[PDB]
Enzyme design. Structure first.
Site, short mmCIF file in Angstrom:
data_model
loop_
_atom_site.label_atom_id
_atom_site.label_comp_id
_atom_site.label_asym_id
_atom_site.label_seq_id
_atom_site.Cartn_x
_atom_site.Cartn_y
_atom_site.Cartn_z
N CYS A 37 61.18 -16.78 -94.53
CA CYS A 37 62.85 -16.01 -95.93
C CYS A 37 62.04 -14.61 -96.58
O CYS A 37 63.40 -14.37 -96.61
CB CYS A 37 63.24 -17.42 -96.83
SG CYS A 37 62.14 -17.45 -98.15
N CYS A 54 60.78 -24.12 -98.84
CA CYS A 54 61.58 -23.63 -98.13
C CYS A 54 62.04 -24.48 -96.46
O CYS A 54 61.00 -24.62 -95.76
CB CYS A 54 60.90 -22.63 -97.70
SG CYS A 54 61.63 -21.46 -96.72
N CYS A 140 64.30 2.30 -88.55
CA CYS A 140 62.93 2.18 -89.01
C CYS A 140 62.54 1.66 -87.28
O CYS A 140 63.13 0.52 -86.54
CB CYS A 140 62.92 1.27 -90.18
SG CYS A 140 63.24 2.06 -91.67
N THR A 143 55.71 -2.21 -86.31
CA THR A 143 54.71 -3.88 -86.31
C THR A 143 53.09 -4.14 -87.69
O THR A 143 53.14 -2.84 -87.99
CB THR A 143 53.50 -3.35 -84.97
OG1 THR A 143 54.52 -2.95 -83.80
CG2 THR A 143 53.29 -4.45 -84.93
N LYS A 154 55.79 -0.91 -78.17
CA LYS A 154 56.66 0.01 -77.60
C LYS A 154 57.79 -1.70 -76.88
O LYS A 154 58.31 -0.78 -76.04
CB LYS A 154 55.38 -0.49 -76.17
CG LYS A 154 54.36 1.12 -76.14
CD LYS A 154 53.77 1.46 -75.13
CE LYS A 154 52.30 0.73 -74.51
NZ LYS A 154 51.66 1.08 -73.66
N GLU A 174 65.90 8.55 -84.97
CA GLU A 174 65.96 9.19 -86.42
C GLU A 174 64.74 9.94 -86.57
O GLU A 174 63.85 8.74 -86.13
CB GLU A 174 66.47 8.54 -87.74
CG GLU A 174 66.44 8.80 -89.15
CD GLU A 174 67.13 8.55 -89.80
OE1 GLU A 174 67.95 7.17 -89.18
OE2 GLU A 174 66.92 8.30 -90.91
N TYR A 225 62.69 25.88 -66.85
CA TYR A 225 64.01 25.80 -67.19
C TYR A 225 64.31 27.07 -66.41
O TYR A 225 63.05 28.21 -66.19
CB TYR A 225 63.10 26.08 -69.00
CG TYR A 225 64.27 26.84 -69.46
CD1 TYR A 225 66.34 25.79 -69.61
CD2 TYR A 225 64.74 28.03 -69.92
CE1 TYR A 225 67.06 26.28 -69.66
CE2 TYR A 225 66.20 28.67 -70.64
CZ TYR A 225 66.87 28.27 -71.29
OH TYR A 225 68.28 28.33 -71.41
C1 LIG Z 1 54.36 3.08 -84.71
C2 LIG Z 1 54.59 1.58 -84.65
C3 LIG Z 1 55.19 0.73 -84.96
C4 LIG Z 1 53.20 0.73 -82.77
O1 LIG Z 1 52.82 -0.15 -83.02
P1 LIG Z 1 51.42 -0.85 -82.08
O2 LIG Z 1 52.53 -2.80 -82.00
O3 LIG Z 1 50.52 -0.53 -82.61
O4 LIG Z 1 52.31 0.02 -80.48
P2 LIG Z 1 51.34 -0.26 -79.26
O5 LIG Z 1 50.64 -1.09 -79.65
O6 LIG Z 1 52.90 -0.84 -78.66
O7 LIG Z 1 50.99 0.84 -79.02
C5 LIG Z 1 51.76 2.30 -78.55
C6 LIG Z 1 51.01 3.47 -78.21
O8 LIG Z 1 50.54 3.62 -79.93
C7 LIG Z 1 49.27 4.18 -79.63
N1 LIG Z 1 48.25 3.46 -81.11
C8 LIG Z 1 49.10 2.11 -81.97
N2 LIG Z 1 48.45 2.92 -82.96
C9 LIG Z 1 47.01 4.33 -82.94
C10 LIG Z 1 46.57 4.39 -83.83
N3 LIG Z 1 46.32 4.10 -85.09
N4 LIG Z 1 45.65 5.51 -82.69
C11 LIG Z 1 45.62 5.67 -81.89
N5 LIG Z 1 46.68 5.28 -81.69
C12 LIG Z 1 47.38 4.46 -81.66
C13 LIG Z 1 47.94 2.87 -78.68
O9 LIG Z 1 47.17 3.11 -78.02
C14 LIG Z 1 49.41 3.01 -77.66
O10 LIG Z 1 49.13 4.29 -76.95
P3 LIG Z 1 49.17 3.97 -74.71
O11 LIG Z 1 50.97 3.12 -74.88
O12 LIG Z 1 48.81 5.10 -74.76
O13 LIG Z 1 48.51 2.76 -74.56
C15 LIG Z 1 53.07 1.19 -85.76
O14 LIG Z 1 51.71 2.77 -85.34
C16 LIG Z 1 53.88 0.82 -87.14
O15 LIG Z 1 54.15 0.12 -87.37
N6 LIG Z 1 53.21 1.70 -87.97
C17 LIG Z 1 53.44 2.11 -89.35
C18 LIG Z 1 55.03 2.65 -89.39
C19 LIG Z 1 55.47 3.59 -88.62
O16 LIG Z 1 54.67 4.73 -88.75
N7 LIG Z 1 56.33 3.59 -88.02
C20 LIG Z 1 57.43 4.61 -86.91
C21 LIG Z 1 57.78 5.18 -87.74
S1 LIG Z 1 58.81 6.72 -86.99
ZN LIG Z 2 60.53 -18.84 -97.67
#
Ligand SMILES: CC(C)(COP(=O)(O)OP(=O)(O)OC[C@H]1O[C@@H](n2cnc3c(N)ncnc32)[C@H](O)[C@@H]1OP(=O)(O)O)[C@@H](O)C(=O)NCCC(=O)NCCS
Ligand SMILES: [Zn+2]
Length: 260
Positions: A37, A54, A140, A143, A154, A174, A225
């Site tokens: 929650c 909970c 937003c 992970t 991804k 965004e 282009y």
């Molecule tokens: C962006 C985010 C959601 C990626 O989540 P994740 O679950 O690690 O993503 P994935 O496992 O699908 O990885 C996607 C790609 O990012 C790359 N990557 C992720 N974290 C990385 C890191 N710390 N350093 C280098 N590469 C990275 C992965 O290697 C992968 O590359 P590939 O597709 O060529 O193999 C995560 O880093 C996050 O939550 N960051 C904090 C919040 C944020 O910045 N959100 C995006 C804001 S616009």
């Molecule tokens: Zn709870």
């Protein structure tokens, strides 16, 4: 003192940013969150009491996808205000995004969970503005750190485009994108575009905007282009490579229950 460490489920996680929890919550060594929650608590003792009481074992809202051990819940900010406010406070520890300080009611939240006999455990989410004037299909995306680098990011990006397709519309995240956001989007976009080549047409087929298709094909040197310029053999070579692999977790349309 700001909140600098949370305990949620079986994890402790250090903060990356300030999040506006009320000041007395920052004062304690740790903030303790119910994993289901998302109530935030000040003490291990209050946390333990809550866990015993909970009744939640999954996110609120509507379960709209289940494949293997992962599920997605759709949570309308209007319908589940407290939950979504709790989610935004959690997320703000790891994101600097203005929407995290705003009303949750104009947004819908897509919560990704791993499912087991104990419950549905949050791994990440994305938010989306209802009727975005800028055509943003994600506000937003997050992970949670302990689950990063497994393909959940991804998956969330792919899921956001699966909704855009069903809405018969293009969309883009965004902007500005964090560096981690950029890496994730470029990877997804690259794979989708190459599978489709193995621009307005690609845009219509994928819900990826022409601008994001153009910037991605530029990085692949497959555009002049704007005109796509690649052979079937070049596309196959890229899809064979370790640089443009399929996402380890993909969205299966026949496991989704969703209409606009
Ligand atoms: C962006 C985010 C959601 C990626 O989540 P994740 O679950 O690690 O993503 P994935 O496992 O699908 O990885 C996607 C790609 O990012 C790359 N990557 C992720 N974290 C990385 C890191 N710390 N350093 C280098 N590469 C990275 C992965 O290697 C992968 O590359 P590939 O597709 O060529 O193999 C995560 O880093 C996050 O939550 N960051 C904090 C919040 C944020 O910045 N959100 C995006 C804001 S616009
Ligand atoms: Zn709870």
């Amino acid at each position: 003192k700001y909140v600098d460490k949370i305990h949620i489920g079986n994890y402790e996680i250090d903060a990356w940013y300030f999040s506006p929890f009320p000041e007395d919550y920052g004062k304690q060594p740790k903030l303790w969150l119910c994993e289901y929650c998302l109530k935030y608590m000040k003490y291990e003792k209050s946390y333990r009491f809550h866990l015993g009481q909970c009744q939640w074992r999954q996110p609120p809202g509507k379960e709209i996808y289940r494949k293997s051990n992962i599920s997605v819940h759709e949570v309308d900010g209007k319908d589940h205000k407290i939950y979504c406010q709790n989610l935004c406070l959690l997320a703000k520890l790891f994101l600097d995004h203005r929407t995290l300080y705003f009303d949750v009611e104009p947004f819908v939240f897509y919560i990704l969970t791993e499912v087991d006999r104990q419950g549905a455990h949050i791994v990440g989410y994305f938010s989306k503005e209802k009727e975005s004037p800028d055509g943003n299909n994600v506000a937003c995306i997050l992970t949670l750190p302990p689950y990063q680098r497994r393909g959940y990011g991804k998956f969330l990006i792919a899921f956001s485009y699966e909704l855009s397709k069903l809405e018969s519309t293009v969309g883009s995240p965004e902007k500005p994108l964090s560096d981690l956001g950029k890496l994730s989007y470029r990877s997804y976009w690259s794979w989708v575009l190459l599978e489709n080549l193995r621009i307005k047409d690609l845009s219509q087929m994928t819900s990826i905007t022409q601008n994001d298709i153009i910037s991605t094909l530029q990085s692949l040197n497959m555009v002049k282009y704007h005109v796509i310029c690649v052979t079937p053999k070049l596309v196959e070579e890229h899809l064979k490579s370790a640089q443009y692999k399929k996402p380890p977790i993909t969205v299966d349309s026949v496991c989704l229950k969703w209409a606009p």
